[PDB]
Each structure stands twice: as structure tokens, then as C-alpha cells.
């Protein structure tokens, strides 16, 4: 059912924007490139903001990532540099009801 994907998950970048889109779903969700590093989740306190889906759902935005920036879990205790060169850099996305899942693709 659900489903979530992103135009330009190889030879990415940097700064560039990328296509996000959503299926199957409804509601509000988060969005936002994580690491798992020191067994925690090192995403951008950045380019992470939030989204609503329509009468259906799928929402379309655009979405920025980055080769390497600050480490950071959720909580909001920063961890360090993220090298997605190195370091598995994805996009999840999704809130209570449903994580949505997240997507890889390599940097470069």
C-alpha cells in the first residue's frame, strides 16, 4: 500500500534537491536524511521538516541532502559529522501510525 520513493537516490551530490513522493497514507509526517552511527540516528536538524498529505495522500515536495554534515538524533543531541560517503545516508519518513519506511542511494 504505502509507498515512498525519491528521483535521485544514486550519484547524488550535494546540495542538490531531490523529488520526494508519497503514496498510500494521509496525515502529517517527517521527512529528513538520518545515519546510523554510535547506534544512534544522526539525521540534518535541517532540510528536516514536515508535510500533509491530501484528500489521498502521496504529498510531492522537494528535498535538499548532503555529502557529509552534523551529526544529530531526533532527541536533539548532536552527535557529529555524517560522511554519506561512508556513512549509510537514507530518507525515512512517516509519524505514529506509520513509519513509512526510508531509501538509501549511494553519493561520489
Known amino acids: 500500500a504505502p509507498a515512498f520513493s525519491v528521483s535521485p537516490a ?3 551530490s550535494d ?3 531531490v523529488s520526494v513522493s508519497v503514496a498510500a497514507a494521509g496525515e ?3 521527512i529528513a536524511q538520518c545515519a546510523p552511527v554510535g547506534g ?3 539525521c540534518n536538524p535541517a532540510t ?3 508535510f500533509t ?3 489521498s495522500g502521496a504529498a510531492s515536495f522537494s528535498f535538499t541532502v548532503r555529502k557529509s554534515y552534523a ?3 531526533p532527541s536533539g543531541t548532536p552527535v557529529g559529522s555524517v560522511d554519506c560517503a561512508t556513512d549509510a545516508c537514507n ?3 512517516g509519524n505514529s501510525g506509520l513509519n513509512l519506511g526510508h531509501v538509501a542511494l549511494t553519493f561520489g
Request: hydrophobic share 25%; aromatic share 8%.
Open 91 to 93: 530518507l525515512g519518513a
Open 48 to 50: 528536516a521538516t514536515s
Open 10 to 12: 544514486s550519484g547524488a
Open 71 to 73: 551529526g544529530q538524533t
Open 53 to 55: 498529505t491530501d484528500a
Open 15 to 17: 546540495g542538490q534537491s
Open 28 to 30: 502529517t509526517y517527517y
Open 40 to 42: 544512534q540516528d544522526a
